């Protein structure tokens, strides 16, 4: 009900969201990153496949001036293109639209959400993981002041291989339920753009404790045409749906980089202790339920 949605009290949560957005955007600007504006419709987007976290659905699509456009799954390809433009360090507050099923309505997913999405030329996985640890520690100390509650105190998070998480816990979420500090999961076989080297994937997810689940994901990247297109073909994806990106790769303009996206609503939910992510959204976007507003 529309009247019901707008009769919720959410002012304290949005006051916290404002403090989080100010803190994070200020951090990246002061670190020397360029602040880019988002892409919403494009011929190319993140396939989100293969990916253990994904259902592999098609993006929303619309015809624009007679040409098929995809609503942004994520800006990953565009981040790589920004690095190809010589911009070195970039971030964006990026809307993502992912039409996941009701099976992903588990309290941490929304079908429309925002990532603070960033990328750094020539960075390695340890560089990005340490940068996120520095950001998160400082944020959690401020959150203690804002809320009057205690937050996790560790500064270097434990690291698990994805294969070990499957063996010990069964899933990323079961691991989250059993942990009291944030932790990393690394080496996850997934999309063509994440860098793979002789069976090892140079990638990482940050997982929150107390069952709150994933909050950030990233990797080092592939930049070579021959490697990228081999991965696309092996996965059975449509090469033509990546054509301009592949033209740029073939021309040699992609560079080595690494980065991550941080789910803003997920982070707000953690800091305020909300059971469901819909509680932190003025206009909920619940997987499998088309919003009335
Ligand atoms: Na290989």
């Amino acid at each position: 009900n529309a009247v019901e949605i707008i009769s919720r009290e959410i002012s304290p949560t949005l006051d916290i969201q404002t403090k989080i957005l100010e803190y994070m955007t200020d951090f990246f600007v002061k670190e020397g990153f360029k602040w880019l504006l988002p892409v919403i419709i494009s011929p190319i987007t993140d396939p989100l496949w293969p990916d253990p976290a994904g259902e592999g659905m098609e993006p929303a699509e619309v015809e624009i001036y007679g040409v098929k456009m995809r609503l942004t799954h994520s800006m990953i390809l565009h981040k790589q293109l920004a690095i190809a433009m010589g911009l070195k360090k970039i971030f964006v507050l990026s809307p993502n639209i992912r039409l996941e099923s009701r099976q992903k309505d588990d309290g941490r997913h929304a079908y429309e959400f925002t990532q603070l999405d960033f990328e750094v030329e020539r960075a390695k996985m340890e560089d990005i993981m340490r940068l996120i640890e520095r950001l998160v520690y400082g944020l959690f100390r401020k959150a203690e002041e804002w809320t009057g509650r205690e937050f996790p105190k560790t500064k270097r998070f434990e690291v698990f291989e994805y294969s070990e998480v499957l063996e010990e816990f069964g899933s990323d979420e079961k691991a989250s339920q059993e942990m009291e500090e944030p932790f990393w999961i690394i080496n996850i076989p997934r999309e063509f753009y994440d860098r793979e080297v002789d069976g090892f994937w140079r990638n990482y997810d940050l997982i929150l404790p107390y069952g709150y689940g994933e909050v950030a994901s990233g990797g080092e990247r592939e930049w070579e045409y021959e490697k990228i297109v081999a991965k696309i073909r092996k996965a059975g994806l449509n090469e033509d749906s990546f054509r301009p990106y592949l033209e740029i790769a073939k021309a040699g303009k992609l560079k080595p980089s690494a980065g991550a996206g941080i789910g803003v609503e997920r982070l707000v939910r953690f800091i305020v202790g909300a059971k469901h992510i819909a509680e932190v959204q003025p206009f909920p976007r619940i997987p499998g339920i088309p919003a009335v507003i």
Side-chain angles (χ1 to χ4, degrees), residues 2-3 5-8 10-101 103-163 165-166 168-173 175-177 179 181-233 235-237 239 241-242 244-246 248-249 251-274 276-293:
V3 167
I5 291 161
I6 67 93
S7 296
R8 290 170 312 139
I10 200 176
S11 188
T13 289
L14 295 178
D15 284 340
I16 293 301
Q17 176 170 286
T18 301
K19 293 188 199 302
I20 292 163
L21 282 167
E22 178 54 36
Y23 184 89
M24 293 206 289
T25 60
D26 175 84
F27 179 95
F28 285 93
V29 169
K30 287 190 169 349
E31 295 293 313
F33 285 68
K34 293 166 183 67
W35 190 339
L36 275 53
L37 294 167
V39 161
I40 308 298
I41 39 162
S42 178
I44 60 174
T45 201
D46 194 337
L48 296 172
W49 192 265
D51 193 323
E55 292 172 330
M57 72 281 145
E58 295 268 30
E61 290 167 6
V62 58
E63 295 288 307
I64 302 298
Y65 309 123
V67 171
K68 174 184 283 313
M69 301 285 168
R70 297 166 166 81
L71 275 74
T72 302
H73 265 178
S74 94
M75 282 187 63
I76 180 61
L77 307 182
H78 294 82
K79 294 200 297 178
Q80 291 193 279
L81 294 184
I83 293 303
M85 291 186 81
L87 300 176
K88 292 170 177 280
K89 304 202 288 183
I90 64 97
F91 82 103
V92 50
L93 288 172
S94 173
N96 287 184
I97 298 86
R98 301 186 191 180
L99 303 178
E100 298 180 273
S101 78
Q103 292 182 305
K104 292 292 184 181
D105 180 20
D106 53 15
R108 68 193 160 277
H109 291 78
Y111 73 83
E112 146 154 78
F113 64 91
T114 282
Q115 293 199 85
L116 196 161
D117 211 359
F118 68 91
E119 200 76 16
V120 179
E121 183 190 331
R122 287 177 183 286
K124 304 299 191 289
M125 69 193 284
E126 166 179 47
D127 301 317
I128 301 306
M129 291 163 78
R130 291 280 185 251
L131 177 64
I132 294 170
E133 284 171 350
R134 184 155 57 82
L135 173 71
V136 170
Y137 181 90
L139 180 60
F140 282 178
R141 299 296 73 71
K142 293 282 184 202
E144 288 171 337
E145 298 164 38
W146 303 336
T147 65
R149 291 184 280 103
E150 299 290 336
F151 280 79
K153 305 276 191 304
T154 54
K155 295 171 159 175
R156 287 185 171 181
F157 306 136
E158 187 170 4
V159 178
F160 298 78
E161 294 250 345
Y162 176 62
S163 63
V165 171
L166 291 174
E168 182 174 359
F169 303 105
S171 69
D172 290 12
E173 179 56 21
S176 175
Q177 291 168 337
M179 296 290 283
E181 300 289 327
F183 61 104
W184 296 107
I185 299 177
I186 67 163
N187 185 17
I188 302 145
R190 59 186 184 206
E191 293 93 349
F192 69 80
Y193 47 73
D194 273 1
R195 195 167 184 206
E196 182 274 352
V197 183
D198 319 321
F200 186 85
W201 290 77
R202 300 248 188 114
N203 63 13
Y204 34 89
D205 291 351
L206 184 62
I207 315 299
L208 293 163
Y210 305 121
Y212 283 84
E214 186 268 5
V215 73
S217 76
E220 295 175 30
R221 316 302 176 187
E222 307 287 8
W223 68 95
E224 189 199 70
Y225 175 74
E226 284 79 2
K227 186 64 141 68
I228 286 169
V229 79
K231 295 171 81 185
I232 288 171
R233 289 160 179 168
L237 298 185
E239 230 172 295
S241 70
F242 303 105
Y245 168 92
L246 291 174
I248 288 164
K253 309 294 176 201
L254 305 179
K255 308 180 184 290
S257 75
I262 302 164
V264 173
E265 298 90 341
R266 283 175 183 224
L267 192 51
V268 174
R269 161 182 183 241
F270 181 71
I271 288 171
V272 309
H276 306 86
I277 200 160
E279 297 170 51
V280 316
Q281 293 180 355
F283 315 105
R285 295 284 180 276
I286 299 165
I289 301 176
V292 304
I293 53 177

